[PDB]
Design a protein around this ligand. Structure first.
Ligand SMILES: Cc1ccc(C(=O)N(c2cc(-c3ccccc3)sc2C(=O)O)C(C)C)cc1
Length: 548
């Protein structure tokens, strides 16, 4: 019942890794300069391994049995199809890790003979063999964060476990359609990845308002992936099998479950046997759907066992938020402890113990929270925000190491109406773009399930369509939000908001001097930086539509 077994071999890197950066341009200020940012590397891999390696004690009950029955009934309402080899190859991202069999993403997408023939043999093998464990590679993820003294030492690198490219294409042929339909079918509104920022805000406000006396809480499972058992994974397969699927897919799904999802041998970058996994692999197609559904099942059963009154849940993988009817502060705490005890028995122990919350602004769901500000007519306007420490630390890093994929562009788009995106990120990046003279150059940013490409000059139209014109007129932010943003800049050692405000005026003027689309960006995105506001009318943005 151990999540992992290790041989002793180390988790090794592929290319040299840099954890501490040279110079920082964001936390830049004539007499004030700092660099309190870092990147996780292979060096902390052993520490992470220790943390995620433990025995899982799982014991189910009637509450769990009941919920699982309901979910399988809901799943039987779903029909899914196999993807063709061509479709599977086309869904393969352009730079996904190459195969050890002489081909890479490029060849998969161009349907080269070598790649196609290999994938076909892998598929045939899945239909013929439902037992032989499929090997996986384990690597330490390189992610950037800001040092946070008060909250303890630096984070250890997360561990990524994934199978060969050939197997990944096959997972899509067999389960991609299911991943796109199943979660919403069994969870409905509770499925978190179906909402745009404005939609998520609407869901939370509605949920909170429908309670006579609301009480909410976020549950943080300690290393969720490591807590899911072989039995949990086989149960996920039974849920998949409850759907209406072609026999060929059923065969492939069973094989993938027994040979890959339920666990298997892991090798490091050097090819050395590193260990055996008996929990969720982070790099397989079903990770998101599996975590989401399994978290939901355990959480719903735990709500019933704990006596949670009228729970409204929002699930994003291992991220869970429960809003219900308060039974009084003392009883709420008692019910939460009961919920936690139930979750623990289901093998979903808490990292940070949950606590009842009676202020919606303080409830974090899917890494975000709802806040409020005033619109142009003075009425309350709700929007989605989040602690800006990590996104700014990564924006500051991606400025000295402008990687192929940006995270700042994504944050600017998803959190466009926030004060930290408007005062800090937009000011900074439009300044960098003009300095580099690459304003019209298209860039690749990362939304969660799909990498996209966009031109910075298209931001105002994109933002209007995504958040409405209010995104350019929001004012009178809450003191909690102002305080949190100021704390982030302090932790990053970057100039404070009052200084960014001075800078935004200069950036705005520069954009307007360039005329054209750049001028539109200046007038719309920085109308907040001048006392005499501009009218700002609807833009021809009613010519776009996004997926994520
Ligand atoms: C993105 C954006 C930035 C500023 C404003 C704004 O109009 N103000 C504000 C200035 C602030 C400020 C200035 C310096 C340091 C910290 C905060 S906070 C604030 C507000 O309306 O909430 C006025 C009180 C002058 C509206 C939107």
């Amino acid at each position: 019942s151990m999540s992992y077994s290790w041989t002793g071999a180390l988790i090794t890197p592929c290319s040299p890794e840099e954890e501490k950066l040279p110079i920082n341009p964001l936390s830049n200020s004539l007499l004030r300069y700092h660099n309190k940012v870092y990147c996780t590397t292979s060096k902390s891999a052993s520490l992470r391994a220790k943390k995620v390696t433990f025995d899982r004690m799982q014991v189910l009950d009637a509450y769990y049995d009941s919920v699982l029955k309901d979910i399988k009934l809901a799943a039987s309402k779903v029909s899914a199809r196999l993807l063709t080899l061509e479709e599977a190859c086309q869904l393969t991202p352009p730079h996904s890790a190459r195969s050890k069999y002489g081909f890479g993403a490029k060849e998969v997408r161009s349907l080269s003979g070598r790649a196609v023939n290999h994938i076909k043999s892998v598929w045939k093998d899945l239909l013929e063999d439902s037992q032989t464990p499929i090997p996986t590679t384990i690597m330490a993820k390189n992610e950037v964060f800001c040092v946070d003294p008060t909250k303890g030492g630096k984070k250890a690198a997360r561990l990524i476990v994934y199978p060969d490219l050939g197997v990944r294409v096959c997972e899509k042929m067999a389960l991609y359609d299911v991943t796109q339909k199943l979660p919403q079918a069994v969870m409905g509104a509770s499925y978190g990845f179906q909402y745009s920022p404005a939609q998520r805000v609407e869901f939370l406000l509605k949920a909170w308002a429908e309670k006579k006396d609301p009480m909410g809480f976020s549950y943080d499972t300690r290393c969720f992936d490591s807590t899911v058992t072989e039995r949990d994974i086989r149960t996920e397969e039974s849920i998949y099998q409850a759907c209406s699927l072609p026999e060929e897919a059923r065969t492939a799904i069973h094989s993938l479950t027994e040979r890959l999802y339920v666990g298997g041998p892991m090798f490091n970058s050097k090819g050395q046997s590193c260990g055996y996994r008996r929990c969720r692999a982070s790099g397989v197609l079903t990770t998101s759907m599996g975590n989401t559904i399994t978290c939901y099942v355990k959480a719903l059963a735990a709500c019933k066992a704990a006596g949670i009154v009228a729970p409204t849940m929002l699930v994003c993988g291992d991220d869970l938020v429960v809003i219900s009817e308060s039974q009084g502060t003392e009883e709420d705490e008692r019910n939460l402890r009961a919920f936690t005890e139930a979750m623990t028995r289901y093998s979903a122990p808490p990292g940070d113990p949950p606590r009842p919350e009676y202020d919606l602004e303080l409830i974090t769901s899917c890494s975000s929270n709802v806040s409020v500000a005033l619109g142009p007519q003075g009425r309350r306007r709700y929007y989605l925000t989040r602690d800006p420490t990590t996104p700014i630390a990564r924006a500051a890093w991606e400025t000295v190491r402008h990687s192929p994929v940006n995270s700042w562009l994504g944050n600017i788009i998803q959190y466009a109406p926030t004060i930290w995106v408007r005062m800090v990120l937009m000011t900074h990046f439009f300044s960098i773009l003009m300095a580099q003279d690459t304003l019209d150059q298209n860039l690749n940013f990362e939304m969660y399930g799909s990498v996209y490409s966009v031109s910075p000059l298209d931001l105002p139209a994109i933002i209007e369509r995504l958040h409405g014109l209010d995104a350019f007129s929001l004012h009178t932010y809450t003191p909690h939000e102002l305080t949190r943003v100021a704390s982030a800049l302090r932790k990053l050692g970057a100039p404070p908001l009052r200084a960014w405000k001075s800078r935004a005026r200069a950036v705005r003027a520069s954009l307007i001097s360039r005329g054209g689309r750049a001028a539109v960006c200046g007038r719309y995105l920085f109308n907040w930086a001048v006392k005499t506001k501009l009218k700002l009318t609807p833009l021809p943005e009613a010519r776009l539509l996004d997926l994520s």
